[PDB]
């Protein structure tokens, strides 16, 4: 409740300069969220380890005995596709991803942070239902044909495909052949993703600093020259707090990290506590509740009225639009 | 007594008499000389940066990034002194380094950064050429080649010579252009037998990504020596048979325990040797 | 005779006596043998393409798209018949082929699609291994390679085999994977001497790009033999002494008029032969 205001006074100078810049970009209309599997699992959506438990047992007879190595975990849906066909690969996807699960309160907080675009690696339909409940239309892009046939110039860019054109495995990149042919099969989804990052403010939700998507995006940033690009923000929702040497390494790679285990004290399995303590700390900084300094009320009224010194008179029915 | 590998041996012994056989020697051979496996060094970068050892099985993210995190934080001189203290050791010659050189190969390519195969060469007296940097491809003085594609410590114990870190695997074709290109010519012209690797190594799958870009029936198919303890599944064997490899497994030829590596490497190789 | 041409010869003879010298046979040695140059072929399409022959000159666009339009519109059998009409020739060998084999080359790599260097090696008894298609890289019978990097008409007088169309030159890394590798493996391990190109040939610009991908001082700088009528200016000479082409210019060594090509080719090679 009022815990967020006494969290806010315990923030250091790094996180305050992240919240001031994420919220200045939402007001400018240059904020884009990059949504991963973390907000999908907070709606009960079938994770990809629950699929890879299906394939290894329909391809090796028995369920798994021991942990998955990274050699095996990447390649089990490719062994199932090559050996056991392509209609059975799409059958297992049809068995688990016919769910109609609910949207978590985090899907509401992303959209209430008023984004210009939403990019997602999630192949679910959960973020697309939540956008249509509200009074804004997003042009969903999940294939190559949807970019030139775009409609509304606010894109929901699903860079990992989607199952709108059926529950077929050729529409969603899942395998390892789909991870190495991505620049060949998706030339226009990649260029549209890299242009939004180059032109907007990016916040990553639902990742963990080791992912195939975060690492292939920080490699693209290594190719760009110095100080030409805005550094993306990265919200970290993990049980363990971040160590200081890791936050140095990812800030030199171009990530501005807001650790959620460094702001609140929560249990190891309470993921909505960690996601809501960073999202509500952005949403209640915009809906201006963290102003208890009595000289921050001066540069808030000044930042909205010092434009209007160039005009002579302003109507009073127009001043109720200056203050939103 | 054997299933379909009896045709696999006969091409190898034909390649041994022709002098057209190249072994791709790995760390599964060099760990037999009680050489320090690489995970011990990652723990040293772990326990100096974190302030504590690894409590359990750490994440694959920080399996390639703790060598780089120590590189970017603690510098270059501190990273270089640890490569002295863990690699300036003397290890004896394994029987396999006699068994690999028993077949009299055409070339020896390896991803091992030690000098253990570089010791069993001059001990047995077979004169090879050690190429490990870009300055040794053009100054190569022999038609037979010992190609250390991951660098070695000849010029010293520095980080500039050897491929360890994460950046050295990505920025690799942009740093070793002629050692990457000399390798793919060797695989095109001579018969390749892998030994000392799993079916999930970084160096093994990056070859199979290249093999698919080649034309069908243009390459002779590479052989693989599997010495993992658990036997290969029937679906795993067909997945690498339909990707270029021809696996010769040790777990289906002999019966051994779960910690009997040196008995497994010899039983496959002596089966290859005694046919010649 | 300046020292620069002297220092070019004193290496090339030492590379020929050590068997590390590789000649890069170019389009110059075929036109001296009066083999049909490609511009009369692009005339032959342009007599059935646009319906009327060349009233004026050509553009560099039409130098690269007039063949491709004929194969698309007139079909596939009409393209191969024109290659059939002009390449059923028995032209003799020039002496310039014999001056190439006179230095005992380690390899001979050419972008010429004629059998003229094939017959020049068969008469002098120099047995090589012709690799033109991709089923010959692994099926090679020897280690001395005759690498036709543009294909040859051994399979037939059809447009599939030889890179001539505009689509054939852009998909060269996707139709000739190994020969694009087998060429660069030879450039790094030998001394390359170019014969038969301008400074602005398309095959020379591609080799100048790959040397930019290489490191500084990691390669022996190849030699270029330029046989143009007008002598190269000293300013242009410095621009290729750092991009990777030492130049032996034929016009600055002897006197010849504006059409004595075979005089300019024969002069520079006899300085190499009589030196050995």
Residue numbers in the entry:
A (entry chain C): 12 to 335
B (entry chain B), C (entry chain A): 22 to 297
What wording appears in the published article?
As a sirtuin (SIR2) family protein, defense-associated sirtuin2 (DSR2) has been demonstrated to participate in bacterial anti-phage resistance via depleting nicotinamide adenine dinucleotide (NAD+) of infected cells, which can be activated by tail tube protein (TTP) and inhibited by DSR anti-defense 1 (DSAD1) of diverse phages. To defend phage invasion, Bacillus subtilis utilizes DSR2 proteins to sense and recognize phage SPR tail tube protein (TTP), then unleashes NADase activity of its SIR2 domain to deplete the cell of NAD+ and abort phage propagation during infection. Each DSR2 protomer contains three domains, an N-terminal SIR2 domain (SIR2, residues 1 to 297), a middle connector domain (MID, residues 297 to 627), and a C-terminal sensor domain (CTD, residues 627 to 1005). Structural analyses and biochemical studies reveal that DSR2 forms a tetramer with a SIR2 central core and two distinct conformations.
The cryo-EM structures of DSR2 from B. subtilis 29R were determined in its apo form at 2.92 Å and its complexed form with TTP and DSAD1 at 3.16 Å and 2.98 Å, respectively. The final models contain only partial tetramer including two complete protomers DSR2A and DSR2B, and two SIR2 domains of DSR2C-SIR2 and DSR2D-SIR2 due to its instability. In the structure, four N-terminal SIR2 domains form a central core consisting of two SIR2 dimers via a head-to-head arrangement with a buried interface area of ~1700 Å2. The complete protomer DSR2A and DSR2B form a scissors-like dimer with a total buried area of ~4000 Å2. Further conformational comparison indicates substantial difference between DSR2A/open and DSR2B/closed with a root mean square deviation (RMSD) of 2.800 Å. Besides the abovementioned identifiable α42, another obvious difference exists in the loop (α30-α31 loop, residues 633 to 643) of CTD with a ~9-Å displacement between two protomers when superimposed. In addition, the small triangular protruding module of SIR2 domain has a conformational change with a rotation of ~20° and a translation of ~7 Å. The result indicates that DSR2 lacks the capacity to catalyze NAD+ hydrolysis alone, suggesting a potential self-inhibitory property of apo DSR2. In addition, the active site suggests that residues N133 and H171 are crucial for DSR2 NADase activity. In vitro NADase assays further confirm both mutants of N133A and H171A aborting the NADase activity, which is consistent with the result of previously reported phage infection analyses.
